[PDB]
Design a protein around this ligand. Structure first.
Ligand code: NH3
Ligand code: PT
Length: 162
């Protein structure tokens, strides 16, 4: 069992724009282990829709190359929980954000969270934000993460983080 507390009072309209994947953590090492790992994805943009759905633009290393992927996240009755059908995941969980700097989110397959759970620390600008990383570490204290990756500014501005 993995219990998740998403942000009360999330306003998805205020997350719009460019983001950078500053850190990522996962319940299962193989989710993120190596360049090719299935949940090793680098968010480029969050585009909320007027009806409050969310388009996620990201990059993934696939056919020897750093590919662009587009995920349509459908809203639910909980503003911080969205339904997806991509990367073999079916939920997006928004843990926390201050809108102006950082956003913490997870993906999972609700049928098996332990085999599934990947969370990220996003920042709006390509700089290391110690505050955002401490919020990420705090948010993850109760999650059973077995791999954690933290990137430098050079990795932030790089195709698939090098
Ligand atoms: N928050
Ligand atoms: Pt908040």
């Amino acid at each position: 069992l993995i219990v998740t507390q998403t942000m009360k009072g999330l306003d998805i309209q205020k997350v719009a724009g460019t983001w950078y994947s500053l850190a990522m953590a996962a319940s299962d090492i193989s989710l993120l282990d190596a360049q090719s790992a299935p949940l090793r994805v680098y968010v480029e943009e969050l585009k909320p829709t007027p009806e409050g759905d969310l388009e996620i633009l990201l990059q993934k290393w696939e056919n020897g190359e750093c590919a662009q992927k587009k995920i349509i996240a459908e809203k639910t009755k909980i503003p911080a929980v969205f339904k997806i059908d991509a990367l073999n995941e079916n939920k997006v969980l928004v843990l926390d954000t201050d809108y102006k700097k950082y956003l913490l989110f997870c993906m999972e397959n609700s049928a098996e969270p332990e085999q599934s759970l990947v969370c990220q620390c996003l920042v709006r600008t390509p700089e290391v934000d110690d505050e955002a990383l401490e919020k990420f570490d705090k948010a993850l204290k109760a999650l059973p993460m077995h791999i954690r990756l933290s990137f430098n500014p050079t990795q932030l501005e790089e195709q698939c983080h090098i």
